[PDB]
Amino acid sequence: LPAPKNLVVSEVTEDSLRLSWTAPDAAFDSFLIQYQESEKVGEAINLTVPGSERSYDLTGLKPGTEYTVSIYGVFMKMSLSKSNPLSAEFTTGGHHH
Amino acid sequence: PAPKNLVVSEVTEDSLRLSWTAPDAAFDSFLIQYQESEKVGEAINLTVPGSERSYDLTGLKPGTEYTVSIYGVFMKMSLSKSNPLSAEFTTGGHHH
Ligand code: NA
Secondary structure, eight states: OOOOEEEEEEEEETTEEEEEEEOOTTSOSEEEEEEEETTOOSOOEEEEEETTOOEEEEESOOTTOEEEEEEEEEEEEEEEEEOOOEEEEEEOSSOOO | OOOEEEEEEEEETTEEEEEEEOOTTSOSEEEEEEEETTOSSOOEEEEEETTOOEEEEOSOOTTOEEEEEEEEEEEEEEEEEOOOEEEEEEOSSOOO
């Protein structure tokens, strides 16, 4: 099954991590990115980005701090379901020929 | 849920005007299938919008029994996520 791959940082500063990853073209409608300080100090944060993105800047971080980052591909599927049928027999007017 | 109360409202020598009931907005459309009863493998299929409660079957043979089936059709939307990809990264600078 499809999934994001190759999660790296392309840039780091004292308060940011610029993420980069790969994914099959149009496999995903969006990405869910979850991040939190690794020791679990501070809030777990959830963000969404468009499915065409392959990079994202995590900003407003604390210096010298380890973060656990998770990325999920998100996909929508549309299908049609069918009820059980209702059936009846009817006869047209007139004389059979 | 499913359509209920399939009847004809009108019959002529060449037509059957179908009528049925369904809960408001239960279905996005209806599938109607019909064929001469004493016949196999000549079925006719069509769809109508989910707001409709009648449909005219025309160009039929006189004095002939027809089997008619109606299905309620609903559009299902699914939202799913892949397996996560996870990594740990350290920001720049000195921890405080
Ligand atoms: Na779901």
